[PDB]
Amino acid sequence: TLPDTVDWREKGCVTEVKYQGSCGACWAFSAVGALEGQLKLKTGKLISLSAQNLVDCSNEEKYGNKGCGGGYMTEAFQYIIDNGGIEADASYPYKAMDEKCHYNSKNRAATCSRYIQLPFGDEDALKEAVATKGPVSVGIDASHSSFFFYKSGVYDDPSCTGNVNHGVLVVGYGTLDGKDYWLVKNSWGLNFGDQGYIRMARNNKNHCGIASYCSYPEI
Numbered sequence: 326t327l328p329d330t331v332d333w334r335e336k337g338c339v340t341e342v343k344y345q346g347s348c349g350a351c352w353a354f355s356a357v358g359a360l361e362g363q364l365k366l367k368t369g370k371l372i373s374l375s376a377q378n379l380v381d382c383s384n385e386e387k388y389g390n391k392g393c394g395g396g397y398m399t400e401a402f403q404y405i406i407d408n409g410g411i412e413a414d415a416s417y418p419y420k421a422m423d424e425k426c427h428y429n430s431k432n433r434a435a436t437c438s439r440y441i442q443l444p445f446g447d448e449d450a451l452k453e454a455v456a457t458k459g460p461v462s463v464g465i466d467a468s469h470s471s472f473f474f475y476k477s478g479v480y481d482d483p484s485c486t487g488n489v490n491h492g493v494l495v496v497g498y499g500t501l502d503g504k505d506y507w508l509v510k511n512s513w514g515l516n517f518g519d520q521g522y523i524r525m526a527r528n529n530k531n532h533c534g535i536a537s538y539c540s541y542p543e544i
């Protein structure tokens with residue numbers, strides 16, 4: 326049986342909530358968050374990895390990422406594979422701007438060997454990954470004003486669609502007052518949601534397309 330409740334924060338696998346600013350780098354934060362979880366599970370050490378490294382160095386047609394113009398978590402993972410590593414946020418800090426790539430292999434802090442995508446729209450498969458693998462990068466439809474009015478409980482706006490536009494991190498799941506949810510880490514600072522987190526409806530027919538583009542890296 327899978328556990329009825331999972332929270333990777335309680336296992337020390339989730340870093341502090343970040344603030345992406347005006348730069349559309351949610352995809353890079355999602356990607357590093359997933360890798361951070363893996364790095365902790367492999368090494369026992371929890372370290373913020375460099376979203377800026379992704380923004381600066383994967384901004385090319387090769388990857389189809391566009392720095393602050395947006396990108397894809399799986400292509401971030403591919404960049405890390407191709408590049409042989411990624412720096413920590415400490416040596417490559419977040420500027421919220423597209424800049425020249427200055428990755429340096431001597432500050433490598435994590436690697437990626439491969440990544441895994443889950444089947445489109447499969448909430449059961451996302452539950453399994455989250456319970457057995459770690460935090461999972463997902464795309465959601467976060468285009469509705471209600472997403473940002475949310476403060477507590479479980480977000481289940483009927484205006485939500487399956488057309489995803491933002492990368493976030495699922496760090497757990499459970500059931501709150503009878504409503505199944507996904508525990509989502511965003512990258513809009515602590516004043517977003519509930520200290521940077523939002524519970525989104527789970528098992529409601531792929532609500533906000535949360536199960537539509539799920540991935541996680543393997544160290």
Ligand SMILES: *C(=N)CNC(=O)[C@@H]1C[C@@H](S(=O)(=O)c2ccccc2)C[C@H]1C(=O)N1CCOCC1
Pocket residue numbers: 345348349350351352389390391394395396397398463464465489490491492538
């Ligand atoms: C975040 N702050 C800005 N949004 C993005 O970067 C999104 C995230 C991904 S997705 O997860 O929404 C997605 C969409 C479609 C198929 C698979 C995943 C897409 C990305 C985005 O807006 N773009 C559009 C411009 O080109 C780069 C990707």
